[PDB]
Amino acid sequence: YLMPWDIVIRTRRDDIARAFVGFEYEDSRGRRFMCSGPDKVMKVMGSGPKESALKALNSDMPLYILSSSQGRGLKPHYAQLMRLFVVVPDAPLQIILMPQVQPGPPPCPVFYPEKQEITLPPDGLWVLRFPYAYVTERGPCFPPKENVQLMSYKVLRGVLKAVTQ
Numbered sequence: 001y002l003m004p005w006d007i008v009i010r011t012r013r014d015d016i017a018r019a020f021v022g023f024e025y026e027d028s029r030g031r032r033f034m035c036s037g038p039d040k041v042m043k044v045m046g047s048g049p050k051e052s053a054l055k056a057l058n059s060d061m062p063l064y065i066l067s068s069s070q071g072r073g074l075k076p077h078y079a080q081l082m083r084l085f086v087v088v089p090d091a092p093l094q095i096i097l098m099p100q101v102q103p104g105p106p107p108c109p110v111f112y113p114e115k116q117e118i119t120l121p122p123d124g125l126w127v128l129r130f131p132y133a134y135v136t137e138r139g140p141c142f143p144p145k146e147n148v149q150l151m152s153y154k155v156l157r158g159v160l161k162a163v164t165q
Contacts, residue, residue: 001044002085003036003053007093007162017091021053021160025079027067033079038062038151057160063103063153064144078143081155084128088120092165095120099159103134103141105152130155 002020009017022034022042034042036051038059067077088095097118101111111134120126134141144153 001034001042001049002087003034003042003049003051003056005053005057005160005162007091007164009091009093009164017089017093019053019089019095019162020085020087021057022083022085023056023061023081023155024083024085025065025067026082027069027077027079029067029069029077031067031069031079033068034085035061035065035081041065041068058157060151060154060157061159062150063101063155064150076146080130080132080143082130082132084130084159086120086124086126086128086160088122088124088126090123094163094165096161096163097126097128097159098161099128099130100156101130101134102152102154102156105149108141108152109136110156 002022005019005021007017007019009015024032024034026032036042037056038061063081064078067079071077097120099113102108144150
């Protein structure tokens, strides 16, 4: 599922446009799930998601989360944030995408696409695919080892901005 993002157009059902957002994690076995915040795997039982996207958009989303399966092995399985889903409504607003990723603790650099600000066209279900591996001039930013604080591996808050026209 994707989280509802209710955007106010004018400071009636006509004053609020509804977008949808989903942060997709993928594990090494190809299992996929959406998160509704840093420590919360989204689970919908019944008539759709109750959780607002505004919480996830205003928080740093972790690049790695523990996969919800106990494998028959001693090693923790991480799922990586691989995709961002965005439903842009047909409404007088601009949705701007600004993806920034920090794949490790400071002084680790921040990675971003070659186009830093991307205005998404109206009436569209869009998917941004994040890099699988991150590499600097000093070499690769390796995935977290056993005993590393996952909070240092993150997609920075503010990945999406809405601007009313």
